[PDB]
Design a protein around this ligand. Sequence first.
Ligand SMILES: N[C@@H](CCC(=O)N[C@@H](CS)C(=O)NCC(=O)O)C(=O)O
Ligand SMILES: N[C@@H](CCC(=O)N[C@@H](CS)C(=O)NCC(=O)O)C(=O)O
Ligand code: NA
Ligand code: NA
Lengths: 320, 321
Amino acid sequence: ADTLSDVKAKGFLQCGVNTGLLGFASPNDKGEWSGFDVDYCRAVASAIFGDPTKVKFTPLNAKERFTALQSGEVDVLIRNTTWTISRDTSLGLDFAGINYYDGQGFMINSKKLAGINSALQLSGASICVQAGTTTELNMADYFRANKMEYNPVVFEKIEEANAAYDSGRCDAYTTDQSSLYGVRLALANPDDHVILPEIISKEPFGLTVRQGDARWADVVRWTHNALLNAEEYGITQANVEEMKKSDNPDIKRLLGAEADTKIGTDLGLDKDWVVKIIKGVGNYGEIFERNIGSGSPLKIARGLNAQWNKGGLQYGIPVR
Amino acid sequence: HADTLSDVKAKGFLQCGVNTGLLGFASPNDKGEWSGFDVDYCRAVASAIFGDPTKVKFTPLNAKERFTALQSGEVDVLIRNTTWTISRDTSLGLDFAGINYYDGQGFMINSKKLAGINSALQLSGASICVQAGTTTELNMADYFRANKMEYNPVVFEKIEEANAAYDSGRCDAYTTDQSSLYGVRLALANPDDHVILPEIISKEPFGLTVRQGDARWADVVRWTHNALLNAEEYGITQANVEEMKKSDNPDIKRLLGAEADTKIGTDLGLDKDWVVKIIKGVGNYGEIFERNIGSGSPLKIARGLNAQWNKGGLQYGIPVR
Ligand SMILES: N[C@@H](CCC(=O)N[C@@H](CS)C(=O)NCC(=O)O)C(=O)O
Ligand SMILES: N[C@@H](CCC(=O)N[C@@H](CS)C(=O)NCC(=O)O)C(=O)O
Ligand code: NA
Ligand code: NA
């Protein structure tokens, strides 16, 4: 398998993304896509083509997402998809990096459910969840462990889950916490909804590729680690051109300005592949802020997804 | 058609590339018995597979022969304070299954011989020993160039040579990964006279290194690592794991293979109780850390970056789910 060569030859990247989740991957009226995971797709396209528009988006629901990657319909799956051992071992898939560390939570309507302030008060609740998710299984674990009753209402379409929760048919919504922010913004009265404090699982969102093509996994992995290194070194969409002439050898090396460097070409890309990425989408923090952080209606704090040296878990492996 | 797992089970032991001799990480005694942080990681993989942490043979490798030994098939895995970098990921036919220790490059001096020095920025002109075939050598050049310091490296082929030249005073300073400086220092004539300066000049994530093209084998190494992390997070130890197997906690039951009709271990190519085998063999991540390089060792390194993710560090066990 040589996915990179195939991608170069067709001139665009085919990406599996969400059907519609605000902040992460959502289309406008014209079918134009934006979001955190979308920008990660555009980052890979930027690394390869120097053009973040060279992407074709395939929206996938929770049940069809893995099949679409296995069959080669999409080249990469970037779609709030949790890295787990069973997905790593039993599906013929690998993970090239974690672009967002999350965890599972519960959301309620505070006007309808007065006095509920903890997930441990939800015994008896009807709770909507989607089939084909970690979410369904973790909820079962949590309620069993805490000796609570519950009525799972299982959906195949996110639109149906959203509707059943918003109508009051379901008392609570469960999914990844960052997704609850996005779901909330699509409801009738977003301000009425409270994400409860409990986080009941680890949900590291993975950059998902097929096994058996290390060169392709390398390209995806190092696009991610380039976004991280760029933010750590203060390299932005706005200054990256200027940063090519930096005195800092780390920065010079990252941006392909070093004498006889072979980093980009060993990866199968051009020497200035990181310049292309950062011009295309900015660094990791810029992607975060415009889509799900302070530059967005979601206002999610960096938290676990801060840089490693600022208290977070996001650690750019060295471009060395 | 590569299948290292099958070949490992067929020959009946695991062949591991390790250090020639670095206290705390990988060191043989007089009888050729091995111990250390990276050594225990090797034994963890052996326990996952064979249920016996001694079903392993060790291949000592200097900085220059370590990648060749893995590429050639002479060793099945390389666990040897080896930094994950893009060039090692893209140009050698190798992959990395995980990061078992986040480190960074530092400098060590004899504070008795070099009094008045408290910063690496005061090292202009100093003779500094370093090994060939390392990230270390390249980063030092970068650091001295960037900071306009006079650059006087002394490059060695073997660690014993570097250690002797530094201790004898032929070199003014020693540079390598900070955790390694702790280990080197313990081998010197008077360990107490040596100070590790505050500056950290690089990222050095130590990686579990395997050949590309064998996903099944990479999964085994990767998930040995993450099992070690998850077990520590869940308070599962060498001493209590047999008891924890009877836990009502669903996460623990699933991790330790006590769930009904679970397929986690067998999908990995191992037995259902593969994590119980690991923890019985070597204990959890924290136990490996403490006995070798932490407060239960002469090195006394703080967890720091290698603390659990929910205790202020970077070490994050991917869910066994
Ligand atoms: N991270 C979890 C949940 C992923 C997931 O699919 N979440 C839902 C709820 S936010 C979603 O994205 N639905 C969109 C769709 O299925 O079309 C997993 O990997 O199983
Ligand atoms: N982490 C650095 C340095 C690794 C390294 O080889 N360090 C030396 C100095 S502590 C070592 O292990 N020497 C033992 C030997 O070469 O036999 C790298 O991967 O390049
Ligand atoms: Na895999
Ligand atoms: Na690789």
